Ligand binder design. Structure first.
Ligand SMILES: [Mg+2]
Ligand SMILES: [Mg+2]
Ligand SMILES: [Mg+2]
Ligand SMILES: [Mg+2]
Ligand SMILES: [Mg+2]
Ligand SMILES: [Mg+2]
Ligand SMILES: [Mg+2]
Lengths: 296, 292
């Protein structure tokens, strides 16, 4: 009956996640009970205007009220709300957040890239990487991409890069950012072989399903990089509203799925990774793991 | 640029669906699903309890905020089996309207049966084959028989997942469901089931029949039967963890499978098409028709 909630204020959708604490004998201590995903796309303002415009600020207030009602319905014990790239990069970020407290009671923390990269479900990663192999946990968002290297059950390198789906669509990725990202991947490939990608983000979960790799009754959904590539070639050459209708994609997903696939494919090409494991956890899950640990 | 919303006040989850007008005429942009499980109160106590009614007010506030975010042109909120059966339904709805601005219509089972996306059904049945469109809810199940592209029968039965878990399904209703299914089978061959509900969409994925890049998810009944045998013996909580089911889904998925398997066993249907549309899509179709 204990519930925790996380609010993930990213650069495309803004999410609410609620999880329950399970019984002791169960495997995972925590199970998802409710997930909401609302496409405010703050990054569309942030990365092109430099600030959050009034329409999205007001919609964020409305959304935070809605998520507050939902947290009240589940009588959640504790929560945290984090915002990432699009709020980091907005000049009026503090004003927008203060309006949201005043009007809704919800307190949003702005977290930097480093905190973002480590705000993960270590419990899920620990179990995936326990064979001691080499893994790259890759979170592709709307404004940034976090890469964490795992080898021999131990964390080796963790970095945030300002390449994301909405920033790419807006054509606002800045000089030398792609190059630095490529250079980091090559230094990883020179030193780590047989890399498996652990892919997270709303885009990779939809890609895994479009490519025929849905989890189903399995513990993990596992997508070959070749399956992703074939799916990419299917999606790239048609327009976005045709992608919507033909493949049952929400409008806020049908455009960003392309640069998302391109990021994963670049990472896979450089590292020679053949497999993407998609555990369907993300930043919200990492918030709830922290909350669970805090309260024991 | 134009958005319509539907609020579907069911007996297990309470849903918000928002679609945009394209230039399919309508695309899904937002879906929210919150498990109030009104039927747990209604089919047992015969009214909505105060906790669930308070949560309904909270929920309609949240969905109203969502509808404001999308500047929706029009909406409709419909309530079905659990509200029909609750003695204080109109009081709860009047208070919801006063406190939130959301007006909920209580619809009867005939209206519920026909409150569907006829645009999607029309495409699935255009070859003129025999189809049963089946909506399995928490409180009632709607059956519509299609043949030669025409509607041949439409009926609602007070059999649902939450009503079954509560052991409140009247035996006479089970007999009527079976008799109608037998009369259909006597008269129509080569039946395909068109299945809808939150439960069927999940059972489709567990059975390895997710659509992904296909137009429709198509599950052989044999695969549903194996998925049922995988899920049944396990405890509700283990299913939750092992098969990644939300708690409000991990119990009702069993009687939902059983309803679908009974339909398939009696009619001999080999296939279930799951087009991932439901009552909420039917509301939005109606709103779109009204404003065209
Ligand atoms: Mg993010
Ligand atoms: Mg990010
Ligand atoms: Mg942590
Ligand atoms: Mg229903
Ligand atoms: Mg019903
Ligand atoms: Mg169903
Ligand atoms: Mg209609």
């Amino acid at each position: 009956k204990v519930h925790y909630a996380a609010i993930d204020v990213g650069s495309n959708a803004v999410r609410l996640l609620i999880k329950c604490v399970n019984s002791e004998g169960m495997e995972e201590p925590l199970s998802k009970v409710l997930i909401m995903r609302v496409p405010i796309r703050l990054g569309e303002d942030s990365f092109t205007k430099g600030y959050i415009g009034e329409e999205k600020a007001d919609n964020m207030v409305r959304l935070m009220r809605a998520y507050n009602e939902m947290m009240q319905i589940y009588r959640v014990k504790d929560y945290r709300a984090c915002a990432t790239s699009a709020m980091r990069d907005a000049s009026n970020a503090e004003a927008v957040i203060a309006q949201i407290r005043e009007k809704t009671g919800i307190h949003i923390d702005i977290i930097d890239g480093d905190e973002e990269a480590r705000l993960v479900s270590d419990n899920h990663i620990e179990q995936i990487i326990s064979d001691g192999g080499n893994y790259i946990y890759l979170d592709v968002g709307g404004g940034s991409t976090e890469l964490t290297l795992f080898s021999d059950t131990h964390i080796k390198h963790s970095q945030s890069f300002d390449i994301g789906t909405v920033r790419l669509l807006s054509e606002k990725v800045r000089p030398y950012v792609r190059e630095a990202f490529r250079s980091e991947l090559m230094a990883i490939t020179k030193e780590y072989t047989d890399i498996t990608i652990i892919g997270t983000g709303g885009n990779i979960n939809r890609l895994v399903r479009l490519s025929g790799s849905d989890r189903g009754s399995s513990r993990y959904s596992i997508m070959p990089v070749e399956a992703l590539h074939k799916t990419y070639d299917l999606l790239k050459p048609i327009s976005t509203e045709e992608r919507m209708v033909r493949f049952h994609l929400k409008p806020d997903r049908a455009d960003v799925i392309i640069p998302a696939a391109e990021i994963f494919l670049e990472v896979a090409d450089i590292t020679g990774a053949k497999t993407i494991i998609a555990p369907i956890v993300g930043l919200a899950d990492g918030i709830i793991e922290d909350l669970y640990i805090r309260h024991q």
